[PDB]
Amino acid sequence: VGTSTLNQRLVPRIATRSKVNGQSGRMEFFWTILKPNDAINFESNGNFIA
Amino acid sequence: IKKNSTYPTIKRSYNNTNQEDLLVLWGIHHPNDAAEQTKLYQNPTTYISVGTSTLNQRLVPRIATRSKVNGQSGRMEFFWTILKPNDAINFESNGNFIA
Numbered sequence: 001v002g003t004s005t006l007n008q009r010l011v012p013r014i015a016t017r018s019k020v021n022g023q024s025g026r027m028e029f030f031w032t033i034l035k036p037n038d039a040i041n042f043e044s045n046g047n048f049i050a
Numbered sequence: 051i052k053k054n055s056t057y058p059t060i061k062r063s064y065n066n067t068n069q070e071d072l073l074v075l076w077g078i079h080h081p082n083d084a085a086e087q088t089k090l091y092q093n094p095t096t097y098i099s100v101g102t103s104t105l106n107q108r109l110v111p112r113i114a115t116r117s118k119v120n121g122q123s124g125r126m127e128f129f130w131t132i133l134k135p136n137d138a139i140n141f142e143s144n145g146n147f148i149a
């Protein structure tokens with residue numbers, strides 16, 4: 001993902017984990033302040049909670 | 051360290067039976083070149099994927115030439131987590147694992 005003030009690539013950390021709410025896979029969410037007249041460019045080939 | 055010339059993946063887990071919180075300590079080795087990686091761990095590209103109820107952490111090593119401290123250039127980063135009661139910590143590593 002990338003904006004005027006963002007640069008981050010996020011590989012998924014596959015790992016055996018304990019069950020929480022009956023599911024052991026995790027889901028790490030993100031947020032960004034997109035200024036006016038500023039684009040956020042998503043580029044993923046997997047794991048993208050769009 | 052690998053036995054013979056083989057380092058199988060370390061599938062280990064531990065339920066915190068003790069209803070008392072548990073501080074589980076481990077670490078990741080950072081060898082000074084790929085030769086020290088191969089000398090200790092036959093797998094060139096390695097990882098340490100630990101996981102608990104409130105943890106998700108994959109740690110690749112960091113091979114870099116470094117200054118000698120205590121007569122040793124390779125580094126060793128240690129980690130910690132509070133394992134709650136009835137919560138399991140699942141270690142999964144194919145190298146560099148200071149178990």
Ligand SMILES: *[C@@H]1O[C@H](CO)[C@@H](O)[C@H](O)[C@H]1NC(C)=O
Pocket residue numbers: 037038039
């Ligand atoms: C759309 O975003 C770009 C930056 O990605 C910005 O330069 C441009 O001004 C924005 N919109 C328009 C059409 O002006």
Ligand SMILES: *[C@@H]1O[C@H](CO)[C@@H](O)[C@H](O)[C@H]1NC(C)=O
Pocket residue numbers: 054055
């Ligand atoms: C151990 O290493 C030797 C090296 O010659 C090899 O022949 C043998 O198959 C290996 N296996 C074990 C676990 O003994």
Ligand SMILES: *[C@@H]1O[C@H](CO)[C@@H](O)[C@H](O)[C@H]1NC(C)=O
Pocket residue numbers: 017018019065066136137138
């Ligand atoms: C063992 O750990 C799991 C999480 O991996 C947890 O759900 C469970 O309550 C713990 N204790 C027992 C007795 O199964």
